Amino acid sequence: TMTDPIADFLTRLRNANSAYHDEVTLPHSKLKANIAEILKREGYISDYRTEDARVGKSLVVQLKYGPSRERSIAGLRRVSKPGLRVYAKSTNLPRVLGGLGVAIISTSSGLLTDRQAARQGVGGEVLAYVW
Amino acid sequence: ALTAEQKKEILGQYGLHDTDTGSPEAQVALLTKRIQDLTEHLKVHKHDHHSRRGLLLLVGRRRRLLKYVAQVDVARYRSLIERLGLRR
Amino acid sequence: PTIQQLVRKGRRDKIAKVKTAALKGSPQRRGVCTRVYTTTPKKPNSALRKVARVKLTSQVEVTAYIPGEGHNLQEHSMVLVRGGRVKDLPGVRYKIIRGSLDTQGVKNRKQARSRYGAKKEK
RNA sequence: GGUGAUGGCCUACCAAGGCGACGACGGGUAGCCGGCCUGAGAGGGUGACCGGCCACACUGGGACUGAGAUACGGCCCAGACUCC
RNA sequence: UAAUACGUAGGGUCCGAGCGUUGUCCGGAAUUACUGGGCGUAAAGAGCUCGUAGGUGGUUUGUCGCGUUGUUCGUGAAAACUCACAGCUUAACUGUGGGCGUGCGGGCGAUACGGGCAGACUAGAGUACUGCAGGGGAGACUGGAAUUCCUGGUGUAGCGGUGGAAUGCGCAGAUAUCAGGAGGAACACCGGUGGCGAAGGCGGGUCUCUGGGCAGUAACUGACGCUGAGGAGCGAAAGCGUGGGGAGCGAACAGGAUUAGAUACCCUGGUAGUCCACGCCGUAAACGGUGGGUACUAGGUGUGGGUUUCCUUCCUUGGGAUCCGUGCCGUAGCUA
RNA sequence: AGGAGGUAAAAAUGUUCA
């Protein structure tokens, strides 16, 4: 069955970005919403709406493309998977794409990039690389 | 192959409230009746492997449900198995 | 595979085959030539390749090539055996090296004398 | 009871338990480590000098002495070997 | 026989009191891949299911702070390694100081994620109700065609068989034809890129018993789910056992033919077996050579089952929407 | 464009480096 909606979310994003879709609807989770907020702030998506479905709540990500359909995202990669959770200390955080990327880190200071995590001196669960 | 009357009979005394079917108690009761009927059917027709497989599936479903009940509250599990004549 | 498959069963490197087992960890061995003789190589090559069945100090009897032009070897000769593959000779992995207290150097070697036990003449 | 000390360590009795697929019990191999070699690293291999710990002192067993004993250059016994 | 690969000379090159060889280890080897591989055809998906342990876990509230993370303390001997300095004339080496000591234990914090605990929810899963399709399975009974055999007429000299023949069957009345009977097995047409089943596989009809699936309703429970080591079960055909049966077919076997030979292809026969009952076996190109579950990612076109809806003939397999299937084609992507 | 089925009987092998 479903085992990580984080990877589901990243995959919906990746496949829609490959197919040049403008929207991505999926189920809602507070964690996925926070991830979408990070992606919005780092500029990998245009916006994200949280709306109501027939049963629960949905996330509608308005993706972003340039004028010549340049994919605003070039890759997504779940890292802390179920079955193998990976945790990063503040020192050995990962540099995605030589730093031009963004690693999503879950910490007790919240959900924040590797840059923010190194700034705040903390680390935690490495959810994704979203160059 | 149970009829609606036999089902409702079972649900009366193994269901929690009037309209419950999905409860583990009710499901286990229904599956127990089906298992009895199918077991007698097989004691006659021993070479009905295609139905014995369905029997095994129902057995697994019943076991899963009883596992859920024992995980939730053990008194329900005990009352269920002693009221149905089950071993575990 | 999956991570749980790995933590259960793990990775096992393919077992490297022990080679030159007749030496038994030694670089060389001493042995008596039990039978000096000549062998015919594989099909593309043809020659009369000089070899010796030698009974080493490891309690192993192996075939060993005799490089160089000439050799003074008879049976009952004390010989020093090294490793080295001779392709055209299939069933052999060991060579004999000069300066073995019987195998004197090759005559008139003047380029690669160290590999054939030849002293410098001056 | 015994020990310096806890403890089936030992003993009488009592109960019938304890360990095992998370690999008991067996078989094989091996002294362990800091370290060393390699390798981008992870890792692999290794355990020489040097330094620490262990074990052993012809084999096996045993205690005595003593603060302390595997008591190499100590004791007792048995055994193999060597010698008078 | 015209060797830059052998041997020697020159000459060049790589090192240099060393140079080469052997042995051993690592590397290269992403060649056991955690970093860092794969399994349609390259080696690689168990024959398929069930299910134990285990692994894994939808949405959400609160809490614990176990994992996790931060900080601090102690320890992580010295030597080593590394950085810097200093000293043996330099270097090696040596020393000094720091770092390292990839960790562990205590203390003090954070609580996003995982997890535990206590709950909540319905989108997964399962149940109920209504319907639906279906060679799903088992048992019993039963039907007609056809073959073969038997009996009896008619009927006479060939039939059969092949590439061509011959064995063979017949002339004791065969083949053929008509009628009747016995028995066995398989079920034409329907019947197909069709349906069902986990797979194997399932096709005459009826009855009985029985399993699974799908759609719709959303009444119910409320993550109960997924996978599944081992294990258990099912598991074509052949085969084995016991007992029946035995028409046809038919390994073996026997003749005939072909052939250089033919232990074969072809022909004529023909035993086990194929069939039934109960059981063993437990394999197959058990193949989609593709494990299961879930989510997403262009479409087109057929077809099977079901729900609805719109032109409305208000005829209607007229079309559309949707769920489940099953096929062909074709993007992106993937692929040697 | 619409519409049954067929026949070729058997007939082997290939020292050298290439």
Coordinates of N, CA and C in Angstrom, one line a residue, chain C:
Chain C
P1 N 18.8 -5.0 -3.8 CA 17.9 -5.5 -2.8 C 17.5 -4.5 -1.8
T2 N 16.5 -4.9 -0.9 CA 16.1 -4.1 0.2 C 17.1 -4.0 1.3
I3 N 16.9 -3.0 2.1 CA 17.8 -2.9 3.3 C 17.6 -4.0 4.3
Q4 N 16.4 -4.4 4.5 CA 16.1 -5.5 5.4 C 16.6 -6.8 4.8
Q5 N 16.5 -7.0 3.5 CA 17.2 -8.1 2.9 C 18.7 -8.1 3.2
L6 N 19.3 -7.0 3.2 CA 20.7 -6.9 3.5 C 21.0 -7.1 4.9
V7 N 20.3 -6.5 5.8 CA 20.6 -6.7 7.3 C 20.4 -8.2 7.7
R8 N 19.5 -8.8 7.0 CA 19.3 -10.2 7.3 C 20.4 -11.1 6.7
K9 N 20.5 -11.0 5.3 CA 21.4 -11.9 4.6 C 22.7 -11.4 4.3
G10 N 22.9 -10.1 4.1 CA 24.2 -9.5 3.9 C 24.8 -9.8 2.6
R11 N 25.9 -9.0 2.3 CA 26.7 -9.2 1.1 C 27.9 -10.1 1.5
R12 N 28.1 -11.0 0.6 CA 29.3 -11.9 0.7 C 30.1 -11.8 -0.5
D13 N 31.3 -11.3 -0.4 CA 32.2 -11.2 -1.5 C 32.5 -12.6 -2.1
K14 N 32.6 -12.7 -3.4 CA 33.0 -13.9 -4.1 C 34.3 -14.4 -3.6
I15 N 34.4 -15.7 -3.3 CA 35.6 -16.2 -2.6 C 36.8 -16.2 -3.6
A16 N 37.8 -15.4 -3.3 CA 39.0 -15.4 -4.2 C 39.7 -16.8 -4.1
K17 N 40.1 -17.3 -5.2 CA 40.7 -18.7 -5.2 C 42.1 -18.6 -4.8
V18 N 42.5 -19.3 -3.7 CA 43.9 -19.4 -3.3 C 44.7 -20.0 -4.5
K19 N 45.8 -19.3 -4.8 CA 46.6 -19.6 -5.9 C 48.0 -19.9 -5.4
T20 N 48.7 -20.7 -6.2 CA 50.0 -21.2 -5.9 C 50.0 -21.9 -4.5
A21 N 48.9 -22.7 -4.3 CA 48.7 -23.4 -3.0 C 49.9 -24.4 -2.7
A22 N 50.7 -24.8 -3.7 CA 51.8 -25.6 -3.4 C 52.9 -24.9 -2.7
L23 N 53.0 -23.6 -2.8 CA 53.9 -22.8 -2.0 C 53.5 -22.7 -0.6
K24 N 52.2 -22.7 -0.3 CA 51.7 -22.6 1.0 C 52.1 -21.3 1.7
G25 N 51.8 -20.2 1.0 CA 52.1 -18.9 1.5 C 53.5 -18.4 1.3
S26 N 54.4 -19.3 0.9 CA 55.8 -18.9 0.7 C 56.0 -18.3 -0.7
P27 N 57.0 -17.5 -0.9 CA 57.2 -16.9 -2.2 C 57.9 -17.9 -3.1
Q28 N 58.7 -18.8 -2.5 CA 59.4 -19.8 -3.2 C 59.4 -21.1 -2.4
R29 N 59.8 -22.2 -3.0 CA 60.0 -23.4 -2.3 C 61.1 -24.2 -2.9
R30 N 61.7 -25.1 -2.1 CA 62.7 -26.1 -2.5 C 62.0 -27.4 -2.8
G31 N 62.5 -28.0 -3.9 CA 62.0 -29.3 -4.2 C 63.0 -30.1 -5.1
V32 N 62.8 -31.4 -5.0 CA 63.6 -32.3 -5.8 C 62.8 -32.5 -7.1
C33 N 63.5 -32.4 -8.2 CA 62.9 -32.7 -9.5 C 62.7 -34.2 -9.6
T34 N 61.5 -34.6 -9.5 CA 61.2 -36.0 -9.6 C 61.2 -36.5 -11.0
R35 N 60.9 -35.7 -12.0 CA 61.0 -36.1 -13.4 C 61.1 -34.9 -14.2
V36 N 62.3 -34.7 -14.8 CA 62.5 -33.6 -15.8 C 62.1 -34.2 -17.2
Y37 N 61.4 -33.4 -17.9 CA 60.9 -33.8 -19.2 C 60.4 -32.6 -20.0
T38 N 59.7 -32.9 -21.1 CA 59.3 -31.9 -22.0 C 57.9 -32.1 -22.4
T39 N 57.1 -31.0 -22.6 CA 55.7 -31.0 -22.9 C 55.4 -30.2 -24.1
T40 N 54.3 -30.6 -24.8 CA 53.9 -29.9 -26.0 C 52.8 -28.9 -25.6
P41 N 52.9 -27.7 -26.1 CA 51.9 -26.7 -25.7 C 50.6 -26.8 -26.4
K42 N 49.7 -25.8 -26.2 CA 48.4 -25.8 -26.7 C 48.5 -25.7 -28.3
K43 N 47.3 -25.7 -28.9 CA 47.2 -25.9 -30.3 C 47.9 -24.8 -31.1
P44 N 47.7 -23.5 -30.9 CA 48.3 -22.5 -31.8 C 49.8 -22.5 -31.7
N45 N 50.4 -22.8 -30.5 CA 51.8 -22.8 -30.4 C 52.3 -24.3 -30.6
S46 N 53.6 -24.4 -31.0 CA 54.2 -25.7 -31.0 C 55.7 -25.5 -30.7
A47 N 56.1 -26.3 -29.7 CA 57.5 -26.2 -29.2 C 57.6 -27.4 -28.3
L48 N 58.9 -27.5 -27.8 CA 59.2 -28.6 -26.9 C 59.6 -27.9 -25.6
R49 N 58.6 -27.7 -24.7 CA 58.8 -26.8 -23.6 C 59.3 -27.6 -22.4
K50 N 60.3 -27.1 -21.7 CA 61.0 -27.9 -20.7 C 60.4 -27.7 -19.4
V51 N 60.1 -28.8 -18.7 CA 59.4 -28.8 -17.4 C 60.0 -29.8 -16.5
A52 N 59.6 -29.8 -15.3 CA 60.0 -30.8 -14.3 C 58.9 -31.0 -13.3
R53 N 58.6 -32.2 -13.0 CA 57.7 -32.6 -11.9 C 58.6 -32.6 -10.6
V54 N 58.3 -31.7 -9.7 CA 59.1 -31.4 -8.6 C 58.3 -31.7 -7.3
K55 N 58.9 -32.3 -6.4 CA 58.3 -32.6 -5.1 C 58.8 -31.6 -4.1
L56 N 58.0 -30.6 -3.7 CA 58.4 -29.5 -2.9 C 58.5 -29.9 -1.5
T57 N 58.9 -28.9 -0.7 CA 59.0 -29.1 0.8 C 57.6 -29.0 1.4
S58 N 56.6 -28.6 0.6 CA 55.2 -28.5 1.1 C 54.5 -29.8 1.0
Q59 N 55.2 -30.9 0.7 CA 54.5 -32.2 0.4 C 53.5 -32.1 -0.7
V60 N 53.9 -31.5 -1.8 CA 53.1 -31.3 -3.0 C 54.0 -31.5 -4.2
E61 N 53.5 -32.3 -5.1 CA 54.2 -32.6 -6.4 C 53.5 -31.8 -7.5
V62 N 54.3 -30.9 -8.1 CA 53.8 -30.0 -9.1 C 54.7 -29.9 -10.3
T63 N 54.1 -29.5 -11.4 CA 54.9 -29.2 -12.6 C 55.4 -27.8 -12.6
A64 N 56.6 -27.7 -13.1 CA 57.3 -26.4 -13.1 C 58.1 -26.2 -14.4
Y65 N 57.9 -25.0 -15.0 CA 58.6 -24.7 -16.2 C 60.0 -24.4 -15.9
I66 N 60.9 -24.5 -16.9 CA 62.3 -24.3 -16.8 C 62.7 -23.2 -17.8
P67 N 62.6 -22.0 -17.5 CA 62.9 -20.9 -18.5 C 64.3 -20.9 -18.9
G68 N 64.6 -20.2 -20.0 CA 65.9 -20.0 -20.5 C 66.3 -21.1 -21.5
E69 N 67.3 -20.8 -22.2 CA 67.7 -21.7 -23.3 C 68.1 -23.1 -22.8
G70 N 69.2 -23.2 -22.0 CA 69.7 -24.5 -21.5 C 69.3 -24.8 -20.1
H71 N 69.3 -26.1 -19.7 CA 69.2 -26.5 -18.4 C 69.9 -27.8 -18.1
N72 N 70.6 -27.9 -17.0 CA 71.4 -29.0 -16.6 C 70.7 -30.0 -15.8
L73 N 69.4 -29.9 -15.7 CA 68.6 -30.6 -14.7 C 68.3 -32.0 -15.0
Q74 N 68.6 -32.9 -14.0 CA 68.3 -34.3 -14.0 C 67.3 -34.5 -12.8
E75 N 66.9 -35.8 -12.6 CA 66.2 -36.1 -11.4 C 67.1 -35.9 -10.2
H76 N 66.5 -35.9 -9.1 CA 67.2 -35.8 -7.8 C 67.9 -34.5 -7.6
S77 N 67.6 -33.5 -8.4 CA 68.2 -32.2 -8.3 C 67.4 -31.2 -7.4
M78 N 68.1 -30.6 -6.5 CA 67.5 -29.6 -5.6 C 67.3 -28.3 -6.4
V79 N 66.0 -27.9 -6.4 CA 65.6 -26.8 -7.3 C 64.7 -25.8 -6.5
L80 N 64.8 -24.6 -6.9 CA 64.0 -23.5 -6.3 C 62.9 -23.1 -7.2
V81 N 61.7 -23.2 -6.7 CA 60.5 -23.0 -7.5 C 59.8 -21.7 -7.1
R82 N 59.5 -20.9 -8.0 CA 58.7 -19.7 -7.8 C 57.3 -19.9 -8.5
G83 N 56.5 -18.9 -8.4 CA 55.3 -18.8 -9.2 C 55.5 -18.1 -10.5
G84 N 54.5 -18.3 -11.4 CA 54.5 -17.7 -12.7 C 53.7 -18.5 -13.7
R85 N 52.8 -17.9 -14.4 CA 51.9 -18.6 -15.3 C 52.5 -18.7 -16.6
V86 N 52.4 -19.9 -17.2 CA 52.8 -20.2 -18.5 C 51.6 -20.6 -19.3
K87 N 51.1 -19.7 -20.2 CA 49.8 -19.8 -20.8 C 49.7 -21.0 -21.6
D88 N 50.7 -21.2 -22.6 CA 50.6 -22.2 -23.6 C 50.6 -23.6 -22.9
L89 N 51.3 -23.8 -21.8 CA 51.3 -25.0 -21.0 C 50.1 -25.0 -20.1
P90 N 49.1 -25.8 -20.3 CA 47.8 -25.6 -19.5 C 48.0 -25.8 -18.0
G91 N 48.5 -27.0 -17.7 CA 48.4 -27.5 -16.3 C 49.7 -27.1 -15.6
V92 N 50.1 -25.9 -15.6 CA 51.3 -25.5 -14.9 C 51.2 -24.0 -14.5
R93 N 51.6 -23.7 -13.3 CA 51.5 -22.4 -12.7 C 52.8 -22.0 -12.0
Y94 N 53.8 -22.8 -12.0 CA 55.0 -22.6 -11.3 C 56.2 -22.6 -12.2
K95 N 57.2 -21.8 -11.9 CA 58.5 -21.8 -12.7 C 59.6 -22.2 -11.8
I96 N 60.7 -22.5 -12.4 CA 62.0 -22.7 -11.7 C 62.9 -21.5 -11.9
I97 N 63.6 -21.2 -10.9 CA 64.5 -20.0 -10.9 C 65.9 -20.5 -10.7
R98 N 66.8 -20.0 -11.6 CA 68.2 -20.3 -11.5 C 68.8 -19.7 -10.1
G99 N 70.0 -20.1 -9.9 CA 70.6 -19.9 -8.5 C 69.8 -20.6 -7.5
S100 N 69.7 -22.0 -7.7 CA 69.0 -22.9 -6.8 C 69.9 -23.9 -6.1
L101 N 71.2 -23.7 -6.3 CA 72.2 -24.6 -5.9 C 72.4 -25.8 -6.8
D102 N 71.5 -26.0 -7.8 CA 71.7 -26.9 -8.9 C 71.5 -26.1 -10.2
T103 N 70.5 -25.4 -10.4 CA 70.2 -24.7 -11.6 C 71.1 -23.5 -11.8
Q104 N 72.3 -23.7 -12.5 CA 73.1 -22.6 -12.8 C 72.5 -21.7 -13.8
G105 N 73.1 -20.5 -13.9 CA 72.6 -19.6 -14.8 C 72.6 -20.0 -16.3
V106 N 71.8 -19.4 -17.1 CA 71.8 -19.6 -18.5 C 73.1 -19.1 -19.1
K107 N 73.6 -19.9 -20.1 CA 74.8 -19.5 -20.8 C 74.6 -18.4 -21.8
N108 N 75.5 -17.4 -21.8 CA 75.6 -16.3 -22.7 C 74.4 -15.4 -22.7
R109 N 73.5 -15.5 -21.6 CA 72.6 -14.4 -21.4 C 73.4 -13.1 -21.1
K110 N 73.0 -12.0 -21.8 CA 73.7 -10.8 -21.5 C 72.8 -9.6 -21.5
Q111 N 71.5 -9.7 -21.6 CA 70.5 -8.6 -21.4 C 69.8 -8.7 -20.1
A112 N 69.0 -9.8 -19.9 CA 68.2 -9.9 -18.7 C 68.8 -11.0 -17.8
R113 N 70.1 -10.7 -17.3 CA 70.8 -11.8 -16.6 C 70.2 -12.1 -15.3
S114 N 69.5 -11.1 -14.7 CA 69.0 -11.4 -13.3 C 67.8 -12.4 -13.4
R115 N 67.1 -12.4 -14.4 CA 66.0 -13.3 -14.6 C 66.4 -14.7 -15.0
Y116 N 67.7 -14.9 -15.3 CA 68.2 -16.2 -15.7 C 69.5 -16.6 -15.0
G117 N 69.8 -16.0 -13.9 CA 70.8 -16.4 -13.0 C 72.2 -16.3 -13.5
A118 N 72.4 -15.3 -14.4 CA 73.7 -15.2 -15.1 C 74.5 -14.1 -14.4
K119 N 75.8 -14.4 -14.1 CA 76.6 -13.4 -13.5 C 77.2 -12.5 -14.6
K120 N 77.6 -11.3 -14.2 CA 78.2 -10.4 -15.1 C 79.7 -10.8 -15.4
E121 N 80.1 -10.7 -16.7 CA 81.4 -11.1 -17.1 C 82.2 -9.9 -17.4
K122 N 83.3 -9.7 -16.8 CA 84.1 -8.5 -17.0 C 85.6 -8.8 -16.7

